[PDB]
Design a protein around this ligand. Sequence first.
Ligand SMILES: [Zn+2]
Ligand SMILES: [Zn+2]
Lengths: 321, 321
Amino acid sequence: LTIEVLVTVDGVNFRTVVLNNKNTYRSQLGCVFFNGADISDTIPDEKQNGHSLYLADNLTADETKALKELYGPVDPTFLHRFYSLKAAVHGWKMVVCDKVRSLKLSDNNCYLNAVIMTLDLLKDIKFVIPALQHAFMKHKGGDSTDFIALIMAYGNCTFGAPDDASRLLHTVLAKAELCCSARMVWREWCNVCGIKDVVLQGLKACCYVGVQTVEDLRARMTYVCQCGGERHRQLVEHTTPWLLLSGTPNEKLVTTSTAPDFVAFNVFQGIETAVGHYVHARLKGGLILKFDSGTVSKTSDWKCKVTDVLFPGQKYSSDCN
Amino acid sequence: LTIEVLVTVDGVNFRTVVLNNKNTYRSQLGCVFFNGADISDTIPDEKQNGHSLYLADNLTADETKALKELYGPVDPTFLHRFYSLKAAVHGWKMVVCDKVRSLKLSDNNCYLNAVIMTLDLLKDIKFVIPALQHAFMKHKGGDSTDFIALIMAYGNCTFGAPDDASRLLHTVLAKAELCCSARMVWREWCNVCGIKDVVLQGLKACCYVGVQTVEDLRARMTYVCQCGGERHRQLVEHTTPWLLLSGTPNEKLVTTSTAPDFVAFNVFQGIETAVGHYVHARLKGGLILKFDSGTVSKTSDWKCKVTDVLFPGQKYSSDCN
Ligand SMILES: [Zn+2]
Ligand SMILES: [Zn+2]
């Protein structure tokens, strides 16, 4: 007995393969998923004749190219991992409180809540990888399974293990590009040795690791110059549609009484308590809304360990003397 | 009161920075490690005057370039993660049984044992990233801490979480290059439509995901051609110094009675038992040596779920008719 199946890695391009009912899918074809399950070690059945199969390895040259076109360059384990993640993340739940989407706590996914709620605030970004852009749109439309499974696949997250929200934000945003101009100019100088400018553009101008405030970002740093004198580093121009700043968890008193310019921030709780818990915070209606994995609390003042902080567009040129 | 410290990201290039004993290291400089601990939120002390500090963020332009030169392009969280991993992996232990190095089980690190024991068998490889090459040499010399912490940092492993050994092998080997020639030629053809060759070279010619035997690798695959006929794919030439093959865990009867050509393989145990345990196996003295995280067992026959399999150099040209 034989069957015909349609094999794809992308859900767009299909090849017809004829199989028997003697050997496994694995022996005949490779690692294959159907309707979310790995069926490699089963024997093909009359029932699946004419059906579509998702192939995870052993790909033809055409499939290798379709893979790169939809997913970018990925490691050889990436389809298996994405297809298994997609199956697993399907049993998670997104809730919406006053139109704000949050991921309910399950399987140590609190870092994913922090990542997704932060990416949801960003304007003028598009993913240069088609699968991610397409999933991002579905997520915006209320269907978040693919986008979450993809972030996990690209981020090398192991289902059920805690992970680093800042690391993931930055890996996800490395796959994105800005749909407008942004620019960041650092000047390094010595009054004897001269001046060097470093210019960053696009998304690179909008993220910075190592400070968590615009005041700190813009401050002058000074250290020993190679001439024996002093050398300085300072931000002299900054123009962006938004600005994300990150550092290691840093205890701070956060207050809305001062109408601060940041719009949102993440918090990591309990470093030594078997390494902790992420909470996403937004500033709205004069209060701090704390979104703790599909739960919300409000306060005007909060002492907490801040990690990432989001600011509105910058339009800065430095001025002195 | 003020002090001078030497700041580095690479242990080769140092800048002198003058600090006070009023503010934290974090406020003055950034995230900093000393002797393996993060001291960012401490106040600098007379005692550390003249000492070297490892900076993890807020890097100058020179440091950014030193970072790329030693580590390659890495995400902005990579130093913090590497320096914390290095501190943590220090409490692990490597044991050597008849000159074979294995990593003792701790904190779900069995996948790392599988990865490191497999990389230890590979000839003619060098890492194109200096930190990895230098750590790899130290590891070969009996000092494995850096190499293990680096594999974890580059692999985005979360200390204490299980992980995918095949994924890690392939990510590590993506950072390596072969010191000799290797070549792999696939031919795709239809007797009506024509012939396309795909040639892979270097390390790419030496790894393949989706089969676990050279017989399977070399077999002919056939499916529907776009002309309405039949289309085939077959390996026609293969020349390498070694060959690593991987697939999803696959129950097999492994025996030495047949003097098989593979030299080693990994096994993953218990998929549904809260996803399992890795064991590294080597073939020596007519037996299978099973290295289960710093433990060894021997047998001539083993029914087990094979994942990666290592073979000696290939020298193949296909022949028929
Ligand atoms: Zn100077
Ligand atoms: Zn044809």
